[PDB]
Amino acid sequence: EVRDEVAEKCQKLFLDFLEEFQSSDGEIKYLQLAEELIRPERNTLVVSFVDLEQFNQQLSTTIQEEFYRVYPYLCRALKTFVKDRKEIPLAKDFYVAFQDLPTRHKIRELTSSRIGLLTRISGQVVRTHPVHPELVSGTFLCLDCQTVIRDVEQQFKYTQPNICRNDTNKSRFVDFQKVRIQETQAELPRGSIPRSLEVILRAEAVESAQAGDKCDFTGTLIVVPDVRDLSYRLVFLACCVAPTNPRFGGQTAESIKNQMTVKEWEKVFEMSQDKNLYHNLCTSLFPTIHGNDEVKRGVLLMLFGGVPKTTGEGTSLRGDINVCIVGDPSTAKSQFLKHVEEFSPRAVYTSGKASSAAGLTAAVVRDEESHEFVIEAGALMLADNGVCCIDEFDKMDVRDQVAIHEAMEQQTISITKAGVKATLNARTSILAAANPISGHYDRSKSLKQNINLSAPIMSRFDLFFILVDECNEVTDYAIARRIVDLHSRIEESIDRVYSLDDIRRYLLFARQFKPKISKESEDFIVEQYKHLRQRDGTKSSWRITVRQLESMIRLSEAMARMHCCDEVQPKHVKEAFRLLNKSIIRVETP
Amino acid sequence: DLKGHSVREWVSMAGPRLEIHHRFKNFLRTHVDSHGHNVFKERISDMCKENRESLVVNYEDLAAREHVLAYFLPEAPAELLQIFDEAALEVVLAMYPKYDRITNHIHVRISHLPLVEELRSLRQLHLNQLIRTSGVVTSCTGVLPQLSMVKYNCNKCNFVLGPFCQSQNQEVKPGSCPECQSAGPFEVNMEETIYQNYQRIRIQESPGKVAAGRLPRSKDAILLADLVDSCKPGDEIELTGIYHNNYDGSLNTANGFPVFATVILANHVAKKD
DNA sequence: TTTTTTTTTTTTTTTTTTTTTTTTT
DNA sequence: AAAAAAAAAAAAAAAAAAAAAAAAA
Numbered sequence: 001e002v003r004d005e006v007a008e009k010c011q012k013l014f015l016d017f018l019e020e021f022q023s024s025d026g027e028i029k030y031l032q033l034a035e036e037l038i039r040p041e042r043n044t045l046v047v048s049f050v051d052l053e054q055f056n057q058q059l060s061t062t063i064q065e066e067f068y069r070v071y072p073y074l075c076r077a078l079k080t081f082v083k084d085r086k087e088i089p090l091a092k093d094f095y096v097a098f099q100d101l102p103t104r105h106k107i108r109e110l111t112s113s114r115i116g117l118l119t120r121i122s123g124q125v126v127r128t129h130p131v132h133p134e135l136v137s138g139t140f141l142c143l144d145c146q147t148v149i150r151d152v153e154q155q156f157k158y159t160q161p162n163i164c165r166n167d168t169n170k171s172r173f174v175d176f177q178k179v180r181i182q183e184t185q186a187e188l189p190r191g192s193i194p195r196s197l198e199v200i201l202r203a204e205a206v207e208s209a210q211a212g213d214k215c216d217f218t219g220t221l222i223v224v225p226d227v228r229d230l231s232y233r234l235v236f237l238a239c240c241v242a243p244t245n246p247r248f249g250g251q252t253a254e255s256i257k258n259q260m261t262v263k264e265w266e267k268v269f270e271m272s273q274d275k276n277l278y279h280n281l282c283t284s285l286f287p288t289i290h291g292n293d294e295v296k297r298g299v300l301l302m303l304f305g306g307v308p309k310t311t312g313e314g315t316s317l318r319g320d321i322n323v324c325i326v327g328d329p330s331t332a333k334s335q336f337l338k339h340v341e342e343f344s345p346r347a348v349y350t351s352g353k354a355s356s357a358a359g360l361t362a363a364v365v366r367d368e369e370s371h372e373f374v375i376e377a378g379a380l381m382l383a384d385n386g387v388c389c390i391d392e393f394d395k396m397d398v399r400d401q402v403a404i405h406e407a408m409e410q411q412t413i414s415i416t417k418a419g420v421k422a423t424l425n426a427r428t429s430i431l432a433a434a435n436p437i438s439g440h441y442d443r444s445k446s447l448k449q450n451i452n453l454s455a456p457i458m459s460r461f462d463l464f465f466i467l468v469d470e471c472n473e474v475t476d477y478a479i480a481r482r483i484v485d486l487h488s489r490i491e492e493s494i495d496r497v498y499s500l501d502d503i504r505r506y507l508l509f510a511r512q513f514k515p516k517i518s519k520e521s522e523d524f525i526v527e528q529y530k531h532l533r534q535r536d537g538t539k540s541s542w543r544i545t546v547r548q549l550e551s552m553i554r555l556s557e558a559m560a561r562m563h564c565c566d567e568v569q570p571k572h573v574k575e576a577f578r579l580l581n582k583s584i585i586r587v588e589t590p
Numbered sequence: 591d592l593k594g595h596s597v598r599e600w601v602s603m604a605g606p607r608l609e610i611h612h613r614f615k616n617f618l619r620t621h622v623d624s625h626g627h628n629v630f631k632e633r634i635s636d637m638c639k640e641n642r643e644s645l646v647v648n649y650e651d652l653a654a655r656e657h658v659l660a661y662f663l664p665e666a667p668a669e670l671l672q673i674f675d676e677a678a679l680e681v682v683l684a685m686y687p688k689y690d691r692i693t694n695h696i697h698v699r700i701s702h703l704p705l706v707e708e709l710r711s712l713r714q715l716h717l718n719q720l721i722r723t724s725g726v727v728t729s730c731t732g733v734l735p736q737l738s739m740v741k742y743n744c745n746k747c748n749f750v751l752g753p754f755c756q757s758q759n760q761e762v763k764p765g766s767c768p769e770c771q772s773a774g775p776f777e778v779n780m781e782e783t784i785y786q787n788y789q790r791i792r793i794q795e796s797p798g799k800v801a802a803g804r805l806p807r808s809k810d811a812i813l814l815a816d817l818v819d820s821c822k823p824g825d826e827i828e829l830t831g832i833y834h835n836n837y838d839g840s841l842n843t844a845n846g847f848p849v850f851a852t853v854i855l856a857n858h859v860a861k862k863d
Numbered sequence: 864t865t866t867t868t869t870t871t872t873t874t875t876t877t878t879t880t881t882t883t884t885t886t887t888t
Numbered sequence: 889a890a891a892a893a894a895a896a897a898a899a900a901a902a903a904a905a906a907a908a909a910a911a912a913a
């Protein structure tokens with residue numbers, strides 16, 4: 001019985017660190033963290049690698065350079081650390097989760113030299129397979145002599161004992177999920193497709209990553225076998241998963257509030273009481289776009305959105321406002337779409353003809369490891385509770401526009417493919433950019449004629465923003481001044497009152513509010529809708545119907561959400577009515 | 591009755607097995623109601639009258655009257671449920687001695703289980719336990735006839751072999767026939783075998799319950815001989831069943847990890863409508 | 864020698880792309 | 889007469905159900 005002296009010493013030092021390390025207060029913080037390890041559904045202790053470096057630098061270096069060959073010993077040290085304190089089940093196992101590794105490595109840097117040693121990487125989750133029980137060590141029965149070969153360690157492969165020494169109920173299982181990631185855009189070398197390595201997650205951190213999220217995985221690169229042939233494939237085994245760019249430094253309104261730090265909440269509350277927050281948000285979110293105040297306001301209300309509701313009969317009241325932008329080229333439409341995509345989390349940007357039906361809505365594949373099927377999430381799904389920016393909408397094929405119309409109609413995608421049916425949820429607002437037919441917007445026609453969108457698509461667009469390129473000299477001078485100032489002073493020249501992170505946190509907090517509609521606001525809405533219908537009694541770019549009342553209600557709800565108010569005051573209704581009225585443009589003609 | 595080393599092994603012993611058997615019989619006889627005197631009396635009466643061969647048992651009352659049995663239930667559902675079936679069979683015979691001619695068996699269904707989980711919250715910790723979930727039926731096959739009490743036919747000596755009860759875990763393999771002691775191929779004898787209805791469904795998380803940045807999860811369930819046709823695609827159903835794992839499911843095939851597939855042995859179905 | 868797991872083969876269907884065709888200005 | 893949208897061809901990929909052969913003990 002040869003003892004791995006390095007592993008044993010690492011275990012001893014790690015246990016000493018666990019039972020000795022003290023926080024700023026002077027208490028053994030990891031003892032307090034382990035206090036919760038007793039409760040079921042809790043078998044992982046998160047240990048910050050900064051603490052490990054601070055306590056025992058040599059131990060941290062040994063772990064980093066010998067992570068795989070010592071990880072079982074770290075788990076054993078944790079098991080001893082917890083068992084002697086409480087009455088945890090004897091068969092219960094425990095795992096050690098590391099985080100805050102100072103250095104990060106690129107997916108292209110995962111050479112064989114990084115095999116079996118600690119490393120942190122960043123990537124984008126493409127899809128997550130289901131969760132399964134995984135056999136780490138169980139029992140084996142010999143069919144020749146009935147000699148039970150016990151606790152044979154499986155190495156990512158069904159490994160029977162190689163030779164007889166001469167079941168499930170008596171085995172230990174750990175959660176297991178194979179989640180596929182891919183390289184980030186920033187890391188992509190010139191003219192190369194992204195790299196994907198399927199990372200593997202275990203107990204506790206078995207669903208911390210969802211498709212479409214940017215996540216940092218900390219763990220070890222390993223080789224899995226795919227006379228005999230040794231065909232190996234690289235695979236990442238992660239002991240912890242965390243967001244790459246955490247939103248909060250610390251789902252219901254109070255839960256989000258506590259999720260934040262003290263300073264973040266101070267900022268959020270301060271801006272909630274900030275009079276003129278509407279203009280401040282408009283300017284900060286789009287510092288480089290001159291004018292076009294109406295479009296900025298529209299996309300802001302879109303980012304906030306309304307309040308979804310369900311009818312007594314079961315009818316679903318749409319509570320997310322869509323927006324479309326149509327006009328002459330070089331009116332900064334795709335720039336609005338890119339701003340929204342780069343800013344808003346869960347924001348997915350696409351093109352006209354570059355996306356097919358399956359990749360735009362959903363697809364199904366069969367799990368390579370079990371009998372179940374997994375669902376490849378299309379662009380629409382990744383925008384769930386977010387935004388989908390469809391540039392060059394008019395160019396999109398009808399076979400896809402039908403799917404987009406379905407998503408806008410019932411918020412859901414129904415799939416019957418590859419042996420599985422599913423009704424999946426897509427609660428997404430749609431920011432479309434459509435070029436006018438002929439490439440220029442003609443002012444002597446209704447909006448129906450100026451664009452090649454089918455009537456159903458236009459019907460459920462809450463806001464249409466027309467950006468005509470009037471050849472005015474003052475506007476051209478202003479645009480040129482702003483563009484040249486941008487290109488002269490790149491990093492500076494953008495004084496946005498609120499950082500994009502602060503606006504993200506404020507948006508996430510405000511989205512939880514569900515404003516009511518008081519009687520006064522209801523009467524004001526009725527009068528405003530009356531007036532807006534009277535507008536259509538010259539001709540407008542498109543008729544006004546009850547769907548405009550729905551849009552006005554949703555816009556008032558979003559306006560209330562912006563100030564984190566709890567009841568829709570008449571002022572919000574007035575602002576929504578004004579914006580929607582401006583969105584309507586007279587059809588001038590000789 | 592907390593005592594011993596293992597819950598399933600504790601019930602496995604004959605002693606506590608018969609103790610639970612007689613205690614459950616006495617609970618069926620004695621637990622009456624707040625006011626509905628002996629609910630199980632009229633329950634069994636109706637079931638026999640319509641020949642339902644089933645008994646829905648509330649968990650609340652069972653826990654109240656016999657807390658030990660209710661505690662033992664979820665930990666080792668297979669053994670407790672089999673004991674309950676055995677008890678209810680003779681209880682029915684005592685109430686309806688002639689009904690013994692009908693199905694020679696009674697199934698016990700358990701409802702209103704206290705703790706209800708979601709398909710995404712299922713973990714290895716729930717293996718081999720009675721669990722209550724909710725979901726939408728996304729697929730359901732026909733009423734396939736599954737072997738229940740096979741009688742293989744030895745080819746060489748044309749002697750039908752005794753009933754080898756079919757297990758939901760492993761396919762039954764006949765030994766050598768007792769007469770000519772041949773380990774030949776053997777073939778099923780459909781005329782003398784008895785079967786049981788076998789339906790397979792898939793239950794997925796309700797879209798209204800899934801979170802924002804997550805996709806619905808699905809689990810396969812098996813309905814057996816009385817729950818069949820209790821669901822159709824598109825139904826929102828509360829399913830209480832055993833998170834069974836050990837039948838054949840282990841990706842021992844090459845290019846595969848030691849993963850385990852999981853199916854929920856359905857024990858009670860309730861359509862929420 | 865006898866089993867078993869693989870190997871194939873033999874059908875069939877499904878999905879993407881391209882090409883060909885039809886309708887409109 | 890020429891372009892835009894639709895339809896069909898066709899080729900490649902996947903499921904799979906079943907019969908036969910090679911390797912293992």
Ligand SMILES: Nc1ncnc2c1ncn2[C@@H]1O[C@H](COP(=O)(O)OP(=O)(O)O)[C@@H](O)[C@H]1O
Binds near residue numbers: 291328331334335
């Ligand atoms: N009002 C404006 N303010 C600032 N920049 C503008 C404005 N209008 C156009 N631009 C500039 O013109 C460029 C091209 O606009 P773009 O959005 O590509 O046109 P389109 O909407 O046709 O795609 C953008 O990079 C943008 O910076």
Ligand SMILES: [Mg+2]
Binds near residue numbers: 333
């Ligand atoms: Mg453009």
Ligand SMILES: [Zn+2]
Binds near residue numbers: 145146166
């Ligand atoms: Zn042996």
Ligand SMILES: [Zn+2]
Binds near residue numbers: 768770771
């Ligand atoms: Zn025989």
